[PDB]
Ligand binder design. Structure first.
Ligand SMILES: [Zn+2]
Ligand SMILES: [Zn+2]
Ligand SMILES: [Zn+2]
Ligand SMILES: [Zn+2]
Ligand SMILES: [Zn+2]
Ligand SMILES: [Zn+2]
Lengths: 7, 111, 111, 111, 111, 7, 7, 7, 111, 111, 7, 7
């Protein structure tokens, strides 16, 4: 899978 | 932070593993986490292959990108957790890495 | 769920380890979590002893009480996580378990 | 030196482990050794819990006190030995540390 | 059988690993083996990343296809070998799996 | 430390 | 990489 | 348990 | 190079292990390899003892002689391989080293 | 029982290991124990080879003879102990088994 | 080395 | 067993 970091 | 939980269901089709992720509401998803705050993602193995799968880690083609800070694993190989401590912005792709009891090859989830 | 983070600072006083917990706001606390929802507690080792401490697990005198469901650990011994999956009501006490590079005795945090 | 042998009998009461030590004459004791010469103490696991207990080490809140010099463990987790090589005077308290097959929490004998 | 040898050179570019395979004649290749007889393929790690890479295994998305029969690994993580014992016809894709000393994420070669 | 579960 | 078995 | 060293 | 394969058959006679090597043609031999080129020797365990034997390595009384360059082992203890990379001339003797499930002593093949 | 202690001094001569046993009185011996009662034998590694030796176990060509009941090992590979619990009469021969940091071959003391 | 058990 | 290297 993919992880998207939007802090 | 937020603690998210995903079940990693592994079945066999045509003799080979298939990874199906289910979320808290029992819905099938792709087990992606768009993350907005520091937290954890916990993956629980539900092995339905009869091949003795156990997590051994989580693998990355770009392991130094900082998106995921750490990986932790339970002693029985039934759980792995991703830790995102310092909120590095961007996206990363990963593959679960598992041992099996049928042979000495490691098992990867699809790229 | 909630993902909580605590730093386990270990110093030496009179030659022996002292465990000081600090929370997200850098405050000293006792590193207790009164938990109200399913989630994770992540403990980060800050070893200031020069004795090469590494987590090897989390120990319980009443390990079958169900309060904590699982323990995960990082490969470098710098992180351990407690998972509370199924919200069993009650209280449990635990001690960190660590290896050290000075001798072959395991290190425990106080009972 | 003297080689002393103690059996660590572990039963379950109310679902939780109980540690009962027996000596060479099959008597229940507290598995303390007042030691007067350099030697070894060998602890033999008799697990009657059905929880797959195995020793993983011996833990100390004051691991640098020198009372016990080293710990050794068998590959099957059925034996642990304490070595007292250099006769440091004083007293120390320890807790056995065990893995189990029911969950990923470590088991400790009482403080 | 034939024993083939390939060097796995790992460098960093833009902070991330790059895998370059070299053959017996020191030529860059893609480290594919079209195999016609039972034998071994030995991969030798040349880590030029300063990230403490060590092989931990070889991973497969289709680990039960029989193309590779077994994987062996050296104790120092510097060598992995693929064994092809029973000449199952077909093609398989694999990714090296490596630990590193900078973080607790596993490293994968590209899919 | 101690953990208190109040579900 | 890829392995091709041609027995 | 406890260990008492009396050398 | 050449990839050679030998089966390590272990039986019990008078309660103790007996090592019988068989070659590719199913013939009993002494499992010696006079080697003339760089290559691998793969040893496959056929344990007929009921004592749960697994390879744990290959041991040498003269381990720095350079005759064998490396040893690799499969995760299940069923295979060990000797690598001879740099063709150091001479002769060396080795003993297989195995764990067993009956006791915590390691098993050696004869000197 | 009796607790006996022997130091395993390992030097290199002509590039290869030499095992010299010393007893409690600092005398060179062959590190044999004629044993008359149940007890332990503790072997302490003094590695003077610069090859990073660590004990990994104790090996036996006749591992089921009952002369030695169990082997225990310290986490740092500096100590191994033989346990003789049930006084089986007879004689057995053993070889120390050690890892080293120069190569992936195991080291054996002479047969 | 060798071990000789004389119980 | 024994290994004999004859390069
Ligand atoms: Zn980050
Ligand atoms: Zn619970
Ligand atoms: Zn001491
Ligand atoms: Zn095959
Ligand atoms: Zn060589
Ligand atoms: Zn015996």
């Amino acid at each position: 899978p993919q992880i998207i970091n939007r802090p | 932070g937020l603690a998210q939980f995903i079940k990693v269901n592994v079945t066999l089709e045509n003799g080979e593993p298939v990874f199906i992720y289910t979320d808290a509401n029992g819905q099938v998803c792709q087990g992606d986490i768009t993350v907005t705050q520091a937290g954890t993602i916990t993956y629980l193995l539900n092995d339905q292959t009869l091949k003795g799968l156990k997590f051994v880690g989580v693998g990355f083609v770009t392991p130094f990108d900082g998106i995921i800070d750490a990986v932790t694993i339970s002693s029985d190989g039934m759980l792995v957790q991703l830790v995102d401590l310092d909120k590095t912005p961007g996206t990363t792709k990963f593959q679960f890495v598992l041992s099996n009891t049928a042979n000495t090859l490691l098992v990867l989830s699809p790229d």
